[PDB]
Symmetry: D2
């Protein structure tokens, strides 16, 4: 819980920089009771800006004071059935470019975002890039032929990938996909980790 | 600024898990406008518990959604004059055990907590342990003789350290210090990193 | 190159601990020239055990002294065509349990090991566990029905997963797969990251 | 031990990328026995360049295949008496600029390099910079007055620090020290972490 994780972590950091309730309360313009209450799980209503200050006087970040994502696994694993996948339709330049079928995710590995992607367009000339993004990405061509584009949107490198091909795109590298010219559509599994 | 860092990071995570304002608003029981406002630096008054939920539906931590500690350096460095050091008097079992003179700290390395410590007691038999702590610690005997105790409080290892000696205590390892028997007091520099 | 990375990193560490060619040569029982030669890319023939000692006197690891995996990407990406996938047949208890079709890998993310796995057996009762392993694993059922087993081999949790289902198994968690009882075989994509 | 750590780690990586002795031996131009021997602690005489290749075919680094620095602590701590400190005399432009008295170091925190530094010169005009370096640095003025210079060697920022002052210099930031003009010499404790 936000409150408890904060309550425990706040007390940790405070002690770490050798401050008592009194000393910390003083730098924040609060009373010793207030601080003590926080360390007792009563910080729940603290605003983001307020958390910002507490973190500041303690010369650290809000992150260092809040608990980890939390656990959502069942004895080590988490499962997702095909019919419970969130479906988000991606739009680029008012066109239906992609369709994101979101696969299993877990708070134990927040950076893991697996997807089954429906590549809707089939005109390489109309390919639309993203500005690259954080985290690496593993790709597997699930169906059809994928026409891949990466690098500089103005003068990019290309590759026509057949069903079963696998790629890796490093973080920050810009990319774009479309079905092979005229083939209608294609599908690929995209795994961000 | 808490609000802006959050505003930027929220939009990052939302997009990362392929959600639009609508989709996210729905899982949270909020309106699309609200979410949009947040991504626009208006999340300042969000409570800790509320931040807890947003982090939860986005399968991540509050930390991943809040900005880093921030920068407080002057072209790479930060300086502290001897007369501006915070002074906290540590008490163990109602006795004045230590006196913490806090040295320079920086939000760029929150785990760095340097101290000039006044070891007040000089009776090894009355040594008082801490339950060990996170982070390693480098020590340098600034003055007098330090009588060091570490490990198991019931049956610990010991060492009489002269002025100029240097030690390293791994994280979680319990320790205690006092001036060499009868010598009155001693001083050591303690650096937690 | 091993030699150059080592040559550059050795000089870094040596300076870091304030040692000159003379000082380092002395602790190792070598001549100043020898050390200088190493820092000049001539360490190529140094044995593992010898590297072990150099690392030791420099109070660090061989890893800290050798260069990173290296880059093997083409402007950010690496591609693998379906016909160039390595094929390793996994055997457990003298039976053909799995068939590993290895997908694209990259020295820029060594922990990334994607696979198309052929689940050969279809008798849950004959399921064979692994002792769990380092790194998390994302799974997607490519075909048929997969009968999953994880946790304690003696009394494990189970799940019958249909085509299109996706799972996540945390690191160190033991697991086993087989095709749904009697269905012959199944295929799943396994991504270790 | 280099050999054993390598023997264990090699087997780990090999299995991780689904290769048997045969498969790995083949990519390296070795026999299955050879590889098996390595995994059995007999890799001791492998040269750096050879380790370089093994790492390469296994799409990773030598570091990932060699063991960590190792442990050198005595129940959590390591101690150094003042008379056993290594003494290195630093020279910049053929002048005796510094004198490094090396304090306790540990393979459990290789980046920790604490020093008692004798600042020999006392002419700010003759201050000599370093090109900055990896890792942050905590400083404490042990004696006299230190004249500090950091940033751009051509047009740097300055500070006259009295005994007891403490500073922090971020990694890569260039710096230089000398005793306050005419005061002869000064001493400071420098802790790289
Ligand atoms: C397959 C498309 C994904 O990689 P994107 O979210 O557009 O970067
Ligand atoms: C010198 C005293 C420190 O080691 P402490 O914060 O009491 O563990
Ligand atoms: C699908 C089987 C893999 O997860 P394994 O290499 O046996 O752990
Ligand atoms: C006190 C001198 C150190 O900061 P250096 O190793 O010369 O950068
Ligand atoms: Fe992407
Ligand atoms: Fe301590
Ligand atoms: Fe596995
Ligand atoms: Fe330095």
């Amino acid at each position: 819980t936000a409150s408890t994780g904060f309550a425990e972590l706040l007390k940790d950091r405070r002690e770490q920089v050798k401050m008592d309730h009194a000393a910390l309360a003083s730098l924040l313009g609060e009373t010793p009771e207030t601080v003590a209450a926080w360390e007792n799980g009563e910080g729940g209503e603290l605003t983001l800006t307020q958390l910002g200050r507490i973190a500041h006087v303690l010369g650290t970040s809000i992150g260092a004071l809040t608990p980890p994502a939390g656990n959502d696994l069942d004895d080590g694993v988490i499962i997702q059935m095909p019919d419970e996948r969130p479906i988000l339709k991606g739009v680029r330049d008012n066109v239906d470019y992609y369709v994101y079928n979101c696969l299993v995710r877990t708070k134990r590995a927040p950076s893991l975002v697996p997807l089954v992607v429906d590549v809707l367009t089939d005109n390489p000339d109309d390919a639309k890039f993203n500005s690259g993004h954080a985290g690496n990405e593993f790709l597997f061509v699930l169906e059809g032929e994928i026409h891949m584009k990466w690098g500089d949107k103005e003068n990019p490198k290309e590759a026509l990938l057949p069903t079963g091909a696998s790629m890796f795109v490093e973080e920050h590298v810009p990319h774009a996909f479309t079905a092979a010219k005229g083939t209608g559509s294609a599908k690929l599994i995209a795994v961000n980790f």
